[PDB]
Amino acid sequence: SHMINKIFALPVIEQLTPVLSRRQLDDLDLIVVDHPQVKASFALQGAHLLSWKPVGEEEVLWLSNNTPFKTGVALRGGVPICWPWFGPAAQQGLPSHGFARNLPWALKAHNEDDNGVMLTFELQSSEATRKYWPHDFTLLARFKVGKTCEIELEAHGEFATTSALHSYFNVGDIANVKVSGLGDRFIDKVNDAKEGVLTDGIQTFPDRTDRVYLNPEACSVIHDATLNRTIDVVHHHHLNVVGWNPGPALSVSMGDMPDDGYKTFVCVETVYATAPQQATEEKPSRLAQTICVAKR
Numbered sequence: 001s002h003m004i005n006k007i008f009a010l011p012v013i014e015q016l017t018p019v020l021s022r023r024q025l026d027d028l029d030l031i032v033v034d035h036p037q038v039k040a041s042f043a044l045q046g047a048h049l050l051s052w053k054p055v056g057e058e059e060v061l062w063l064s065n066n067t068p069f070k071t072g073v074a075l076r077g078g079v080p081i082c083w084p085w086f087g088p089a090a091q092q093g094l095p096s097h098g099f100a101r102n103l104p105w106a107l108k109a110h111n112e113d114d115n116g117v118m119l120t121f122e123l124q125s126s127e128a129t130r131k132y133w134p135h136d137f138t139l140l141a142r143f144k145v146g147k148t149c150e151i152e153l154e155a156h157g158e159f160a161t162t163s164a165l166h167s168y169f170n171v172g173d174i175a176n177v178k179v180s181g182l183g184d185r186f187i188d189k190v191n192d193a194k195e196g197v198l199t200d201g202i203q204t205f206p207d208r209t210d211r212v213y214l215n216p217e218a219c220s221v222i223h224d225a226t227l228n229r230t231i232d233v234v235h236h237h238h239l240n241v242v243g244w245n246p247g248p249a250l251s252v253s254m255g256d257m258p259d260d261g262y263k264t265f266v267c268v269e270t271v272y273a274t275a276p277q278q279a280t281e282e283k284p285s286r287l288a289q290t291i292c293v294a295k296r
Contacts, residue, residue, distance in 0.1 A: 001170070003065040004051045007032065007041050019112055026069040031107055033117050033145055040117070040145040043075060046101035047121035047141040050078040054147045057293050058227055062168040062265035067256050072102050076256040077168045077265070079151060079289075081141060084133060084161035086273045094132060097166065100139060103129075108140075116146025125157075135159045137279075149291040156284045160276035164242065164269045165289045167233070171266050172226025178204045179222050179243055179268055183215035187274070205266055208247030212273060216241040220268050234290040235270045239277075242269040 007030065010023035019035040030050070033040040041050045053059045067076035074080065074095070082097035089095060095102070105121040112118070123139040130136075137157035144150040151165055171177050182201045188194050189210040203211065220241055222231040235241055244267040246254065251262035270289040279285040 001051075001059045001063065003063050003067070004041070004053075004059055007051065008034065008039060016110070017112060019117060020110060027071045028069040029104075031119065033119075035112070035117055035146070036114075037116055037146045038149075040143075040149070042119065042121075042143075043069075043078075044104045044107065044121075045071075046075065046081055046103065047105040047123070048075050048078050048080060048101060049143065049151065050075065052145060052149050052291070054149075054293060057295075058229070059170045060149070060231060060291060060293050062170040064257050064261055066258050066261065074101050074256075076254070079168070080164075080166040081153060082164040082166050082271075083139065083153065083155065084135075084137075084159070084163060086162045086164045086271060098163065099129070099133065105139075105141065113146075116144060119143045119145075147292075150288070151290075152286070152288045154284050154286050155279050157279050158281060160278055161285060162273050162276060163285075163287055164271040164273065165287060166267060166269050167289060167291075168265050168267050169222055169231055169233075170227075171222065171224050171264060172228075174205050174245055174263055174266060176225035177222065177266050178202050179220055179266060181217040181220045182211075182213045182241065182243065183217060185214040187212040187214070203243050205243070205245045208245070208250060210244050211242060212271070213241045213243065214274065222266060222268060229293060229295050232290075232292040232294070233268050233270075234292075236288040236290070237286040238270045238272055238288075239275055240271045240273050242271050242273070243267065244269065 014022040031042045040052045063077035083100040105123040108122040109120040121141040125136045140154045142152040220233040277285040
């Protein structure tokens, strides 16, 4: 979290409200929440929740001290919004995880309390956007940050998507981490998409792990023995959960993560991937994740 600190140290370009401001790190406008109950930060690019620290806690979200902050380049960490496909594209030459995380959204709305801050971000289809995904849409992302954190994605239009909230959670040492509540069946993307079965819903992360759980509980729990805390992750409207850590070899290969980056995070993702999600004029597709922390 040197990188998160670098963020809260930036000068203010606009004081939106006594608690919300807009700042800039290289190429990217950020929206920064400095509030008595919470510090959180966002990039307009990809409405990307970059950090989240409820008062009295260690940073809950992990952010790479290597991620570029460049126009149209995906941020490494935080909660990448993966939309309108999850994972590698159908067509060679299109990126993994959609294009929403690549484009500027508009901060459409915000209110605050003594408890926290709500923000609504918006992203609209364009004649630009359509050359590679030929569909009109309006995508909304809503956040309530305070002592808990709520993230809500809503897509309007008439189409199928596959998507994820690709959350990176800050963890003391991936070696003392287990994540419970994962259920039984999973698909192991690291191993030829084979199916396996947990007998107790607990995944550990000895090395590279990339798992799509078919039957997780609503709430996944990160147990962290270094920082001495659990992190609750509650999934809504989703089909799957995914647990991922690159491991050392990939953490090195990746230009946008430090060699030892994988030591300090686990992704527990809220996903809709093993079947298509349909939005319609009347019924927009939705995905949501709620996060809590508790020491000990």
